[PDB]
Design a protein around this ligand. Structure first.
Ligand SMILES: [Cl-]
Ligand SMILES: [Cl-]
Ligand SMILES: [Cl-]
Lengths: 221, 211
């Protein structure tokens, strides 16, 4: 079966080097053009590089010239993208795809390249329901996950039992270089004394788990 | 060669006829393709050579070229076809894509539920105070969020994030976060989130050290 399995992705420092692999099975690789196209989170499709099947004449996008190097090896039937002089603009999922009928038919699953200076685990803060969070029989509560780097953090509520009403927002880049996101849920107001609400924050690059029971704001007077 | 794609977004109904166009910056002959992508999955080849159907793709799909105008059309939009679409040109050697056409679901207008969240006392230990305003399940996407500290309109110290369309009610939800210094937060008192969306304006407020 024609399979395009990618590997090599991971965290990498700026002006550094990482090698992605595009393992081709089924077909011969040196018989079709091969391309790398990438996609920065929440952005469009950007072509990165191509390698010709005969005599391995390579061509790259203006943005990557001289920094990225594409290569192939028929022994392993895999193409490589050697990335050098890595920038933060290079953070993206990198796909490999085969050329067929003037376009691109088969694709890899895509491996993530995460540029980073240093790893920062998250601080998690409660977004507590109160009278300023209660409208039309509905109370809102959530979890603020702040100052982590890099992505992703994943958020669940009550270990996945609580799924309806949930909104986990895309992470945003604060002017500090650290990421930040919130995960909220709307629940019936009456439930606030009937059910506990726990957000489960997972940040694999710092091996941090946090579990935050979100409770109504206690009134001081 | 710039593949300029239009529109960036549009909302139609199931059974609507839908047309997406892509205009090449210089003649690319007919060396053009169309892809569909659904979140967290690789693109699927839809049309190759401007007009020819890739084998296996549904027949409501089709493309066409007039000069440097390349068009994609779904004659009767099906639920599976709600996605983002991309054109591509492959002339000579440098490949370029379109910016994207998000095809979203039409639904009736809806005002947001507006909730406001003071900073937690745990956070103040770090010297920064975050105020979060939540706009819940509204349609369509367009919304202005303004932040007021002691009646003084803020700028530069807020950021916004929007969800994609909800898988059930096809609404959007937005959050805004205002970031202040601990000291700046503890000197002022009244914190307000003003929301304008559609023909609706909502202000939610609290006074520091309330409840
Ligand atoms: Cl960093
Ligand atoms: Cl995606
Ligand atoms: Cl308060």
């Amino acid at each position: 079966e024609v399979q395009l399995v990618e590997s090599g992705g991971g965290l990498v420092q700026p002006g550094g080097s990482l090698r992605l692999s595009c393992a081709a099975s089924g077909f011969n690789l040196r018989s079709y053009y091969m391309h790398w196209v990438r996609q920065a989170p929440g952005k469009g499709l950007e072509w990165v590089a191509s390698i010709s099947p005969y005599y391995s004449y390579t061509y790259y996008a203006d943005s990557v010239k001289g920094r990225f190097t594409i290569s192939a090896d028929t022994s392993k039937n895999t193409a490589y993208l050697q990335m050098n002089s890595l920038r933060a603009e290079d953070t993206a999922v990198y796909y490999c795809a085969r050329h067929g009928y003037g376009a691109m038919d088969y694709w890899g699953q895509g491996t993530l390249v995460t540029v980073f200076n240093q790893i920062q685990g998250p601080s998690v803060f409660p977004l507590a329901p109160s009278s300023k969070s209660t409208s039309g029989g509905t109370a809102a509560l959530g979890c603020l996950v702040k100052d982590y780097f890099p992505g992703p953090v994943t958020v669940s509520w009550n270990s996945g039992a609580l799924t309806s009403g949930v909104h986990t927002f895309p992470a945003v880049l604060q002017s500090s270089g650290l990421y930040s996101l919130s995960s909220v849920v709307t629940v019936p107001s009456s439930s606030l004394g009937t059910q506990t609400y726990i957000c489960n924050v997972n940040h694999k690059p710092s091996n941090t788990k946090v579990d935050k029971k979100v409770e109504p704001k206690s009134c001081d007077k | 060669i710039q593949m300029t794609q239009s529109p960036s977004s549009l909302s139609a109904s199931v059974g609507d006829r839908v047309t997406i166009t892509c205009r090449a910056s210089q003649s690319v002959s007919s060396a053009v393709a169309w892809y569909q992508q659904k979140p967290g999955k690789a693109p699927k080849l839809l049309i190759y050579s401007a007009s020819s159907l890739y084998s296996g793709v549904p027949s409501r799909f089709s493309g066409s070229r007039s000069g440097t105008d390349f068009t994609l059309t779904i004659s009767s939009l099906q639920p599976e076809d709600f996605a983002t679409y991309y054109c591509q040109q492959s002339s000579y050697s440098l490949i370029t894509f379109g910016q994207g056409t998000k095809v979203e679901i039409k639904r009736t207008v809806a005002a947001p539920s507006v909730f406001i969240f003071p900073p937690s006392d745990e956070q103040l230990k770090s010297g920064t105070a975050s105020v979060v305003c939540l706009l819940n399940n509204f349609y369509p996407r367009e919304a202005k969020v303004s932040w007021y500290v002691d009646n003084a309109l803020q700028s530069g110290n807020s950021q916004e994030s929007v969800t994609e369309q909800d898988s059930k009610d096809s609404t959007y939800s937005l959050s805004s976060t205002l970031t202040l210094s601990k000291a700046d937060y503890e000197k002022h008192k009244v914190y307000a989130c003003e929301v304008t969306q559609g023909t609706t304006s909502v202000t939610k407020s609290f006074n520091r050290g309330e409840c």
